Predict the structure of DNA polymerase eta.
Amino acid sequence: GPHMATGQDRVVALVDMDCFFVQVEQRQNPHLRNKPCAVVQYKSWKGGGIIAVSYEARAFGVTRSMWADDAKKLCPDLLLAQVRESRGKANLTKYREASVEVMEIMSRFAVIERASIDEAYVDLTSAVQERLQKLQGQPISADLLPSTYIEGLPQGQKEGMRKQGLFQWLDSLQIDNLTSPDLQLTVGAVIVEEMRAAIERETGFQCSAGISHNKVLAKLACGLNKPNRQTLVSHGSVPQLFSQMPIRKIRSLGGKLGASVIEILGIEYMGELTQFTESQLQSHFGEKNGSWLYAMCRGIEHDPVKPRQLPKTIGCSKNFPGKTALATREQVQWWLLQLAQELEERLTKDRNDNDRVATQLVVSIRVQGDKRLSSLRRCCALTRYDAHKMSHDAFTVIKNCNTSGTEWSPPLTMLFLCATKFSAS
DNA sequence: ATTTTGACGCT
DNA sequence: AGCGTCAA
Ligand SMILES: Nc1ncnc2c1ncn2[C@H]1C[C@H](O)[C@@H](COP(=O)(O)NP(=O)(O)OP(=O)(O)O)O1
Ligand SMILES: [Mg+2]
Ligand SMILES: [Mg+2]
């Protein structure tokens, strides 16, 4: 009762851009706007591989990882934008720069955690407290929440349903209580409406958001009403929401760990986890995972929003599948140089922008026939931002993988260079 | 022969 | 450190 934590101490939002790379391309090229569209990498093999899909194209069944040639079978009028190629490889600079546009806007509202190229968490707890003081007990008009869904409501047209749910929620709020978690989430949603309006006004890009008490629930909430909408998941909404929620839908449970939860416990839904003691869950999944699951299935998580707006690593990667695998020393050295030149360009820009220098170079390769994605991943010192030195050092680190008694055997099917371990500069 | 990323955990 | 998991 009075000593049972409820995980309602923070207001956390997760903002995630809608079909992000597509919107970047649609801003640049108005002919792509409001069309079935996808972003592809490469072209010669099966029309290229799709990495982002507009909602209009998703209605035809087009998905990420599809070859463009097959997507065209589902959607004959599908429009395509190609990722830039530089030095023989896909180059993601346009999307990294568009991401910075969005992150810098979000950072005006609160400190952010950059969780991917297109999404960030924000801890709105302080901002909500401030806004609740500026409010002075006044009620919250539905007009301040024009794109907000309240998960679980209404209870007892889709825009009409959205407004019915919001009306039920607001009618039940105790606006007189500055410590009420539900009121805090509501003010958080007002702030997120403002943040999302600023992103769209200042970049042209639309996004969705989740508002809840922790990162996992905010991320889950965000996807409930994509695109171009935001969703509030209250603590009270958790039992019903989790009662039919597949375990794999919760962040970190979409892979082998989640599959093992399902198999070992004989359950399907997140809510079913409440029927195990913390010790039982720790016995199956480890101390850390077990405690995390015990709290998470009750809607409780403590993972903080970390104050980090910039990536911690800067990497360059290229696969050489099938016949294109690298079988000569000239080939390996040429491609290591291509990757190192892109890396040097990005590192020099990062140093000028962000007052830091990377100090370690990680080199990773895959050899043809290896079942693992990396046959070798080894580090060396990164002492100067020079592409020829970095590529020579990478070659020195990998050269003893060549079992050729000029030739490279087995052929290399992947090269990867990554700068890590930044220090102030 | 989806690829190109990038954070964090384990030992 | 090097390897693995998870997800964008
Ligand atoms: N497997 C992959 N390989 C390469 N790039 C990928 C990728 N998955 C995503 N990206 C890139 C391209 C994506 O645009 C971007 C963000 O990924 P999301 O937020 O997971 N998906 P999006 O924003 O497109 O649609 P939604 O409205 O459902 O959020 O990351
Ligand atoms: Mg997105
Ligand atoms: Mg995303």
Remarks:
- The longest strand of chain A covers residues 407-424.
- Residues 16, 20, 51, 115-119, 251-257, 362, 372-374, 376-379 of chain A lie near DNA strand C (CB under 10 Å from a C1').
